[PDB]
Amino acid sequence: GDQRFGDLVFRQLAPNVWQHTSYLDMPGFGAVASNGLIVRDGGRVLVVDTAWTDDQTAQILNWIKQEINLPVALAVVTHAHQDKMGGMDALHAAGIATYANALSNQLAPQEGLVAAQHSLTFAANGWVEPATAPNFGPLKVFYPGPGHTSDNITVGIDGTDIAFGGCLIKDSKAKSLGNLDDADTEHYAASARAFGAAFPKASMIVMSHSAPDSRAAITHTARMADKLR
Template sequence: MNSKPTILLAFFFAVLLGCKSQNTGITYNSETLKIIPISKKSFIHVSYLQTDDFGKVACNGLIYMNEGEAVVFDTPVDIETSDELIDWITKTKKQSIKAVVINHFHDDCLGGVEAFHQLNIPSYANHKTIELAKREGNAIPQIGFDGKNELMLGKQKIINRHFGEAHTKDNIVSYIPSEHLLFGGCPVKSLNATKGYLGDANINEWSNTVNNIKIAYPDLKIVIPGHGDYGDVELLDYTISLFKTE
């Protein structure tokens, strides 16, 4: 029997498996925190919130790095996990954290914001988010804005904007033009997701709000939802259809 084809086949599978193991899509993983690279400068951070209605829920946030600095979008769910994330950014990646941006007033967005405040890292949020966080007794972001806020990270712009009510009345989205990336947070659903928690939602306006986001950013390539897998503009289309009212 000629062993050459067998050797070539074994080599092919070894390369295939080797490539797969090097591209697992996770750059950091612990029991409480997972970090997933989506570009050279952008990473999803995932932490886990224990809920009464939905059990243990994986919650997405974003890290954007540029020219030695980083901005974090939504904190991990608690202070301890936020400390873990901060250590990874500052010690492993050697980036200075310039700011943290909060999507809305729920714990899966700002549960660990005090970890950033303790290091004098400023937090930004919609004025409505600050009001609602105070009312709920949640941690309170420091710097409020109405409608729209822009941050610069090096020479790159970050646009934080309130398009209308959806998952909550205060929810914003964050857009990074240079990355063609939208951190949608909970106003945006992953493909095939259910409607989820609606206790603070405006289901009548949800589709309109997301449609306005789609119109404002026609060159989107990456869309990150508050929970579940990231994707592209298809996530906006799915969310619009999910909450479409006749």
């Protein structure tokens, strides 16, 4: 989106929404982008996903201070992998309340990650139990079922055409589903489709590892995941 701050990139997606992007050198893959979101809700800022590292995550907070200059109220993190929860310490150090799927917090220690302070639980229909997501504002949080990981969750932003698939969703031209080490091969395809069904009005699909795409990204992803079963 062209805003470069330190080693991160910030792209405005809507008047109150930005994508944050951080990079990690992974031999044999290159310098790998990971995307999250920043949302302004009135007088506060909400964050979706950390950067890969604590330092990068501190940089996200520095950008927010400089460009928005409102307090960060809370952060929700999609799953227990380094690109989504690598920077938990920086959020906690800043006094930011953090939230994750209960299962993500249970998985975090063995993954070498810090758990969020708070656990989300999910209803029958996959939607977050409201009582476990206080003050989430426009963030609508949905568990689509196991896919990229057992614990992967997704987030739509109310008042926008934006839904965030995290690492569940790949772009419409992706040549693979990327990392499948912790993937649920049987359930991935249905979980990807369920994400689309939860946010039917979303025309902009934000994801971890490619620039924002149309709903064709969901279509393409589920079709790749089909070949896993």
